[PDB]
Design a binder for these strands. Structure first.
Lengths: 144, 100, 141, 75, 142, 185, 62, 66
RNA sequence: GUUAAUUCCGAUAACGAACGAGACUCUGGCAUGCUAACUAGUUACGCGACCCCGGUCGGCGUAACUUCUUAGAGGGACAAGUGGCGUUCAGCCACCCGAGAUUGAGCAAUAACAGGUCUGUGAUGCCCUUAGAUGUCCGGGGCUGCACGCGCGCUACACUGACUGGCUCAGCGUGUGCCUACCCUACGCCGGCAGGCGCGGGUAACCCGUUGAACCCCAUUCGUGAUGGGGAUCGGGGAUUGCAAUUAUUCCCCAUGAACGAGGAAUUCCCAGUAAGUGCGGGUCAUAAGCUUGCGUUGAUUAAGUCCCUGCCCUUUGUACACA
């Protein structure tokens, strides 16, 4: 309870990303890319998980119940609007992608934009503001 | 019989002189007169820059139109109303008479 | 006894939610556990039974004044939309989250639609409203 | 620069020296408890509710931003 | 019996609150709820100086109801502090002697003068060329 | 209670001012007792209307500084209210007296000024305001980026400034501002 | 050099470069006869007492 | 500065030398005495002239005026 | 001498005068005194709902009233009374009494800049083009472009706080268009939301609206961690207006989570509801506030002095300056 339980997990090596046991369960998932403060909270309610404990007390069998909701949201009826990748470019899959496929997914669409030679791709090539920002007064620090 | 007369005028004393004039005209015929209801005015705020160009210090206007409306209720048919309302009227006052 | 104006509204909201515990027939929507309560919110509430708490908080709003509609409930349950880098402005609440409460309050009879629209609280909804009001005033004495 | 490596859950020693010396201190608040015990403020706040139930500390003034606790009555 | 009804208005920066004295029992309520139960609860005893510094026995024969609108929170509490102190002043002036009314007034005179004479402080107009009524924008040289 | 008032629970009476120079510029007794450290205002209108304002209100009004806290007397009254039990549950005496003892021991006698600086004695009103001011900003800095809350920080220094153990921030600048004045005099 | 108390008996005028100090003719509550001149910062009325560290330093009259 | 201008002062000089019996001492009576016997376009000047008259009253019973 | 004042007193080869200041217009504030209100409310009667004779209800219809709503006529404040200073004149300070014993803004003199505006004009002298036009109109782009510097601004650097719930309060206003094809919104459904669909009200004290604003108050989580601070950059998806959004027009959801640990030289504004915090109206708007213009909430520290600096107004003085 208030004293330390048995079976300590300090770092949870989950999908080759460290998860601290010092933080709460509701926000230690956020260190994984592809899940933030919002998408981690709904997962604690898809499965019957109490969020009032720490990330060093929860048991090893049901943390497998947590991570199967990461890459497979639809069979646990997670709606499509929580997903970082809705209507994927190749296979059109409504899915959530977590910190390892996430940056794999990140480097097709950049040279997919480069090979089409679109304006959105070109601004990434010279590293300029693609969303339509003013570069006359801002954007100085990384560019010398 | 329940006739509404609307008294709108830009000048304060042009509206005030006619709002009491209809009281004097109607009390001679000695019928049921309601008092003039003073309802809150509308003022027209316009703030523009004084300089025709954009050069110089930033100064702003305060252009205003206060408009006043007075409502007086009469319990009479329209024969009495059509006689008095044509006497002593001035163009600063816009008069609207509603039979209903 | 006393009405709800003699009862503090801070602990009144879960006292009527406790009345909603013993009923347990509010036919709550499926998306209670996974929705964001407004566009100016960013995360989900910490309290799980927020639907049973807001519906209890909706009933005490309808007792003070009637004729309230969907837009009126979004206005009171709105708040500051912290726009981040932009200045913060007031924003309205979510529409369906208040639409389901008034639909939950008409499922089990606590509200009826007043003339010219709106939602007003039924006399029997006021009748048991005084019983939970008297149980708190007797508790504090 | 100075990183506060605070303690997340009570050791056997810390839970032992919470049951004895804390009911000797005249001022118990979760702000100083997390500072003095070298623990988190979540652990400091969670440590003070059961002492209220155990009858070792007394609440005199509670608030959303600050809660204050003292010793038991001297008599 | 006779209708000993006294209606006394209270004004503030924007909040206006009107008390309603009558010959009745010793209960005080504003907008249908008593003086004890008003959020913000930081200022509870500010509603009590008319009660504490004059006594509950002075309010035994008078019941008051206050209708409050306008302004903000602290304007409304400061409205209903001074609206209800003037309410008891006018009740004991019209129906009984002011010898009793002057000896409750001088208690309120020596404590705080806002209870009877309202503060004529109001927000003055904002002028052009500045974000506030007095402050101006940052003047840039060169 | 038309005869006596209680500041929440604290006594109107038995608060003593040690130094006789500041007894006219500390408003705590027999005319300036109020239930709250909040009032209507108007004491900033005249030059010398400032002296008769209650010192608990003056410390409250000097507290909501540094930007985001400006115009927040409703919450600084909450800070002041909780801070008095911390005094009563650390030392055990009247917090009004401990606040009074902190004003005298944090107020410099002489101070230097540009007229090569010449040391001139401060006003008894000037000694009150600077003593209030030095113990307030220290609570602002101690509560900044620290687990210890603002309510504790107010009660820490004025307890320390009452005894003058050179650990409050107000004591050190009071020593330094007179040490500088002691040099070039 | 004991701590002494000095009671203001009449004010003279504003002194200093910015008018930041008030030159005050000041009397002593320890003895009525002996009394000196000192410049005082801050707003000072009639009927208040000062706390001079030493009574041997006297301000000149401008 | 509450210094009376020449328009207020010169208007108050003619009233005293013409209406010595009509003028009183207190402010409010000769305020109304000067209301009928002077065409003053505004109430503010009516108080200012009568107020300056009252200040000249205290000079009259204490001796002559230049 | 006095004043905010060439404001007066008083002297006087100056006198009589004129503009300006003052005066004057609007607003604020005090009058249970006057007029009036069924597009504003209050008080009583009679019910209805609930609780144990009484209490509450923006629940319902009646008679009196303007205390709360409104705007009209008057009044009120004048250094008026007192104690002092002062030629005892001009006037000044303090006090009683009193809502005020200095509210704020408008207007504003002679002369001058070669200040800015010809891109506001069917204001225009003169110069230029005028049919392959420097004239009209259409398609696209751009004015936003980015090694850098500067100016006005918004958001943070957190625990006085971030988050999640509950509680509880405003006033300025505005709203269906001559051309004009385009209004503000109640209420009832669909969708998490952006938003989509139906019916009505309001040309406006009627409907929005009793403008259920932030702020504030109460109760959890976080625990000094670049942390649930912070939201820059950026990916994917969904909606509105428009003929058309890519150089992301905007809005909504998920995700990415940088600098920034209170800011050097130097510099800006302000003393009373003032600063500062915080939200709401209007402008530009088909789509639209980081700006600006007003309104409203919370609401102070300091000072009632000075020419030290920056400057301004008189008098004397000196000048080899007079585009000074």
């Amino acid at each position: 309870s208030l004293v330390i339980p048995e079976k300590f997990q300090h770092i949870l090596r989950v999908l080759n990303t460290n998860i601290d046991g010092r933080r709460k369960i509701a926000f230690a998932i956020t260190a994984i890319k592809g899940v933030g403060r919002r998408y981690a909270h709904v997962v604690l309610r898809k499965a019957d998980i109490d969020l009032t404990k720490r990330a060093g007390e929860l048991t090893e069998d049901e943390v497998e119940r947590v991570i199967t909701i990461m890459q497979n949201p639809r069979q646990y009826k997670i709606p499509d609007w929580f997903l970082n990748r809705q209507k994927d470019v190749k296979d059109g899959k409504y899915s959530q992608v977590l910190a390892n496929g996430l940056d794999n997914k990140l480097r097709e669409d950049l040279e997919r934009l480069k090979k089409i030679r679109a304006h959105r791709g070109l601004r990434h090539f010279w590293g300029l503001r693609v969303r339509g920002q003013h570069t006359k007064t801002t954007g100085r620090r990384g560019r010398t | 019989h329940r006739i509404r007369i609307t008294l709108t005028s830009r000048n304060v004393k042009s509206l005030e002189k006619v709002c009491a004039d209809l009281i004097r005209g109607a009390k001679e015929k000695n019928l049921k007169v309601k008092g003039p209801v003073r309802m809150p005015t509308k003022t027209l705020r316009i703030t523009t820059r004084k300089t025709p160009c954009g050069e110089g210090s930033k100064t702003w206007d305060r252009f205003q139109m206060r408009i006043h409306k007075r409502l007086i209720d009469l319990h009479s048919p329209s024969e009495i109303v059509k006689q008095i309302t044509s006497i002593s009227i001035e163009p600063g006052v816009e008069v609207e008479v509603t039979i209903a | 006894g006393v009405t709800v104006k003699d009862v503090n509204q801070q602990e009144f909201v879960r006292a009527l939610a406790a009345f909603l515990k013993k009923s347990g027939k509010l036919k709550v929507p499926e998306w209670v556990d996974t929705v964001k309560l407004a566009k100016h919110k960013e995360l989900a509430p910490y309290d799980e039974n927020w639907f049973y708490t807001r519906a209890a908080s909706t009933a005490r709003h309808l007792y003070l004044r009637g004729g309230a509609g969907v837009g009126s409930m979004t206005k009171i349950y709105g708040g500051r939309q912290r726009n981040g880098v932009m200045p913060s402005h007031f924003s309205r609440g979510s529409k369906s989250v208040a639409r389901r409460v008034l639909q939950a309050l008409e499922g089990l009879k606590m509200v009826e639609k007043d003339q010219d629209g709106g939602r007003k609280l039924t006399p029997q909804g006021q009748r048991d409203l005084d019983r939970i009001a008297g149980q708190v005033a007797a508790a504090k004495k | 620069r100075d990183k506060l490596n605070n303690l997340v859950l009570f050791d056997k020693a810390t839970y032992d020296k919470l049951c004895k010396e804390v009911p000797n201190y005249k001022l118990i608040t979760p702000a100083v408890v997390s500072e003095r015990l070298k623990i988190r403020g979540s652990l400091a706040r969670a440590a003070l509710q059961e002492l209220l139930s155990k009858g070792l500390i007394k609440l005199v003034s509670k608030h959303r931003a600050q809660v204050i606790y003292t010793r038991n009555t001297k008599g | 019996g006779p209708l000993q009804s006294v209606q006394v208005f209270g004004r503030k920066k924007t909040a206006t609150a009107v008390a309603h004295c009558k010959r009745g029992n010793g209960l005080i309520k504003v907008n249908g709820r008593p003086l004890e139960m008003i959020e913000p609860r930081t200022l509870q005893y500010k509603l009590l100086e008319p009660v504490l510094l004059l006594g509950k026995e002075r309010f035994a024969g008078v019941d008051i109801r206050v209708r409050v609108k306008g302004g903000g929170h602290v304007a409304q509490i400061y409205a209903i502090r001074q609206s209800i102190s003037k309410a008891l002043v006018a009740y004991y002036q019209k129906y009984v002697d002011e010898a009793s009314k002057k000896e409750i007034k001088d208690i309120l005179i020596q404590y705080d003068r806002t209870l009877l004479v309202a503060d004529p402080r109001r927000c003055e107009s904002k002028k052009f060329g500045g974000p506030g009524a007095r402050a101006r924008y940052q003047k840039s040289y060169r | 209670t038309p005869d006596i008032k209680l500041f929440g629970k604290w006594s109107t009476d038995d608060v003593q001012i040690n130094d006789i120079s500041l007894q006219d510029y500390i408003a705590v007794k027999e005319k300036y007792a109020k239930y709250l450290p909040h009032s209507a205002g108007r004491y900033a209108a005249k030059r010398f209307r400032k002296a008769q304002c209650p010192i608990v209100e003056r410390l409250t009004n000097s507290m909501m500084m540094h930007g985001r806290n400006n115009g927040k007397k409703l919450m600084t009254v909450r800070i002041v209210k909780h801070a008095f039990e911390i005094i009563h549950l650390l030392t055990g005496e009247n917090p009004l007296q401990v606040l009074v003892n902190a004003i005298i021991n944090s107020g410099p006698r002489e101070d230097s000024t540009r007229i090569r600086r010449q040391a001139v004695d401060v006003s008894p009103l000037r000694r009150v305001n600077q003593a209030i001011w030095l113990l307030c900003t220290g609570a602002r800095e101690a509560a900044f980026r620290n687990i210890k809350t603002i309510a504790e920080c107010l009660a820490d220094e004025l307890i320390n400034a009452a005894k003058g153990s050179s650990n409050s921030y107000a004591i050190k600048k009071k020593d330094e501002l007179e040490r500088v004045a002691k040099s070039n005099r | 050099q004991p701590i002494k108390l000095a009671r203001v008996t009449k004010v003279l005028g504003r002194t200093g470069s910015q008018g930041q100090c008030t030159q005050v003719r000041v009397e002593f509550m320890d003895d009525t006869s002996r009394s000196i001149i000192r410049n005082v910062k801050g707003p000072v009325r009639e009927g208040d007492v000062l706390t001079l560290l030493e009574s041997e330093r006297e301000a000149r009259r401008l | 500065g509450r210094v009376r201008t020449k328009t207020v002062k010169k208007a108050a000089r003619v009233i005293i030398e013409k209406y010595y019996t009509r003028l009183g001492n207190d402010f409010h009576t000769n305020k109304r005495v000067c209301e009928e016997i002077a065409i003053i376009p505004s109430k503010k000047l009516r108080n200012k002239i009568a107020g300056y008259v009252t200040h000249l009253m205290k000079r009259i019973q204490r001796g002559p005026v230049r």
